[PDB]
């Protein structure tokens, strides 16, 4: 008698997990690009700071000429600092999406199992 009622709840549950697989797949595509850009920018910062330590012996002496290299190296560090701050904020926003979708998938999966058992009985 429940030839359709069991279907309707499972046929929904299989789309429920399908639309959710797409979420987690796109979420891992956003996450990976955001880690690779953060790792890229985090190092172009690390270079800049390592360039500072290299020149900050000229730092006290604004006539030295190397001081100019230390001066400019600070800007390299600062422009990179803003870059490691945006792409970190963007990566963190993309890291929530992966944790939320990995959980939402799991919660769609186990919810569907319940309706999958509500199939062998109703039919």
């Amino acid at each position: 008698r429940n030839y359709e009622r069991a279907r309707a709840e499972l046929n929904q549950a299989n789309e429920d997990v399908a639309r959710n697989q797409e979420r987690q797949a796109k979420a891992v595509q956003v996450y990976n690009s955001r880690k690779s850009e953060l790792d890229a920018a985090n190092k172009t910062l690390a270079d800049a700071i390592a360039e500072i330590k290299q020149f900050n012996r000229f730092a006290h002496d604004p006539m030295a000429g190397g001081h100019r290299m230390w001066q400019m190296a600070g800007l390299k560090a600062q422009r990179a600092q803003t870059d490691v701050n945006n792409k970190q904020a963007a990566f963190d926003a993309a890291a929530k999406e992966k944790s939320d979708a990995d959980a939402a998938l799991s919660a769609a999966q186990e919810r569907r199992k319940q309706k999958e058992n509500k199939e062998k009985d109703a039919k």
Binding site: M69, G74, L75, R79, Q81
Partner: protein, 576 residues
């Protein structure tokens, strides 16, 4: 010079004898006779001035008054903070054209209570406007392929309107090309009535300068600097018999390119410092008793462009300074005073004040005592840069001074001692990578000046002694010269005008940059002689010659960087 007028003391006119603080005045006459080709050379010979330069003209240079930091002298053009100091937070006159200079009023001592920030060592007011009418075509040829061509004129339009104009081109070699300077200056001053007056005033300069830069493969050599600056002053003066009013506005814009000729001035690799500076001042003075009381406001705005001064983005610093000044001579006493409070958009408010006493014990001999507090504001870099810190406080300075001035048998002399306790200095820390607010310094020195005629001879000598030290380490602040002797002998003879400027600058202490770690080294103390003649052919043509550094000495002020020895200049000027 004694008993002539200055404006720098409290923004208004007063006889220089009546300014209690130690003072010096330089005239165009004074400058023309010295055949000076840079502002640094005009200052280089005034007492307490100790200058260092990375070589020839246009080269990065920094002034130390009375042993203080480069960032502790306020340099004013016509009374407003030198617009070139804006980004650096440090005065540098190697780039400011000599052709605008007409008067230098220079008062040694704390003056934050009158002018706000960075007037600790003293004040250098470089005045661009003078009251000698007529017109002068002038030229100069010198060594290091130095050339200079210069026209200036001031003329009446009516009885009430005076127009003054000058253009100046100057270029010198001595790095591969050196320093090229082009200046244009226009000013008109009107007289609405006997006491009401107003003036517009614009001047700009272009400065192409070449320098030696740190080389790194695969990266462009930013060894060329193009500087464009212009300024626009506009005023309204009421000069009455009992009250005086100054309404002054200025707008300075400056663009400072460092680039690689090969890559281009607009190429991404180039460093551009754009900085716009606005000022509105009101100044008032009211004759009260045998003296006066003054009170004005001065406001300033400094905007920068993203990138400017090695900071990511562009900042807006606004500052308002309300101030009050008193001056009163009672009997043989004299009390001078000033108060100030600057409210900065950056670090809130800060107060400042000085007070001086002048009792004349014998007619023509008196003793001056004085105390003053002066500050210095944290600069663009050390606030918003990577090393920067936005919560920095101003550098603080307590200053005390005692002096004896007197006239003895045709000689005017001064023996004076000063104490200067700069505290809360802004310093960079390696182990953290930030600018902190820590350092201190105990500066003690003596100033000994005397000028006198001996027959056809006119002597202007002065002695300075300074021992600037770190208050913590008791170790001496480096690159200062222990003591200088500045002596000039002027005696025109057979219409031949003569002047022998001498200078013994003592021992600096600089760091050596050949081996690492960088080891501090001793600089030799040396004498410097200069010879200058001027003959007047017509009541118009005056031909002047100069041999600078007669004895071809091998001095340096920045260890490593060489400064020229034997060098010659022939020049002529045509007054009509």
């Amino acid at each position: 010079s004694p008993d002539t007028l200055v404006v720098t003391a409290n923004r208004f006119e007063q006889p220089r004898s009546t300014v209690l603080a130690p003072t010096t005045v330089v005239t165009r006459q004074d400058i023309d006779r010295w055949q000076s080709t840079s502002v640094n050379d005009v200052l280089r010979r005034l007492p307490g001035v100790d200058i260092t330069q990375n070589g020839g003209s246009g080269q990065l240079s920094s002034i130390f008054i009375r042993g203080t930091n480069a960032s502790h002298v306020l340099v004013l053009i016509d009374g407003v903070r030198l617009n070139l100091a804006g980004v650096s937070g440090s005065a540098d006159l190697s780039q400011f054209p000599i052709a605008l200079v007409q008067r230098v009023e220079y008062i040694r001592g704390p003056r934050s209570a009158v002018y706000g920030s960075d007037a600790i060592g003293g004040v250098v007011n470089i005045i661009t406007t003078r009251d000698e009418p007529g017109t002068e075509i002038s030229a100069g040829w010198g060594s290091n392929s130095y050339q200079n061509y210069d026209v200036s004129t001031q003329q009446q339009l009516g009885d009430k309107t005076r127009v003054t104009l000058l253009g100046d081109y100057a270029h010198t070699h001595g790095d591969n090309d050196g320093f090229l300077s082009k200046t244009l200056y226009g000013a008109l001053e009107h007289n609405f009535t006997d006491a009401w007056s107003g003036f517009v005033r614009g001047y700009g300069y272009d400065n192409r300068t070449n320098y030696d830069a740190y080389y790194s493969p695969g990266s462009p050599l930013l060894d060329t600097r193009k500087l464009y600056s212009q300024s626009w002053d506009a005023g309204l003066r009421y000069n009455g018999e009992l009250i005086k009013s100054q309404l002054i506005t200025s707008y300075s814009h400056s663009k400072d390119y460092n680039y690689d000729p090969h890559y281009g001035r607009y190429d991404s690799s180039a460093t551009l410092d754009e900085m716009k500076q606005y000022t509105v001042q009101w100044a008032n003075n009211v004759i009260v008793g045998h003296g006066s009381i003054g009170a004005g406001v001065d406001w300033q705005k400094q905007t920068t462009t993203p990138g400017t001064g090695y900071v990511e983005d562009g900042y807006d610093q606004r500052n308002t300074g309300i101030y009050l000044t008193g001056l009163q001579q009672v009997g043989d006493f004299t009390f001078e005073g000033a108060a100030r409070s600057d409210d900065n958009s950056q670090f809130g408010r800060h107060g400042t004040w000085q007070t001086s006493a002048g009792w004349e014990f014998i007619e023509g001999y008196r003793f001056i005592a004085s105390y003053g507090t002066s500050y210095k504001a944290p600069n663009l870099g050390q606030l918003y840069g990577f090393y920067g810190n936005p919560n920095l406080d101003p550098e603080k300075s307590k200053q005390w001074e005692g002096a004896f001035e007197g006239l003895t048998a045709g000689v005017n002399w001064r023996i004076s001692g000063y104490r200067n306790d700069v505290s809360d200095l802004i310093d960079y820390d390696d182990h953290t990578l930030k600018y902190y607010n820590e350092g201190k310094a105990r500066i003690k020195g003596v100033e000994a000046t005397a000028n006198f005629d001996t027959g056809p001879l006119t002597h202007t000598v002065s002695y300075d002694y300074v021992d600037a030290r770190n208050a913590i380490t008791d170790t001496p602040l480096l690159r200062r010269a222990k003591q200088q002797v500045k002596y000039q002998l002027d005696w025109q003879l057979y219409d031949f005008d003569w002047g022998i400027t001498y200078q013994y600058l003592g021992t600096r202490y600089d760091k050596d940059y050949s081996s690492y770690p960088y080891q501090t080294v001793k600089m030799g103390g040396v004498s410097l002689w200069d010879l200058a003649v001027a003959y007047p052919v017509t009541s118009h043509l005056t031909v002047r010659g100069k041999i600078a550094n007669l004895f071809d000495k091998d001095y340096e002020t920045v260890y490593g960087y060489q400064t020229a020895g034997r060098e010659y200049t022939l020049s002529g000027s045509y007054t009509f």
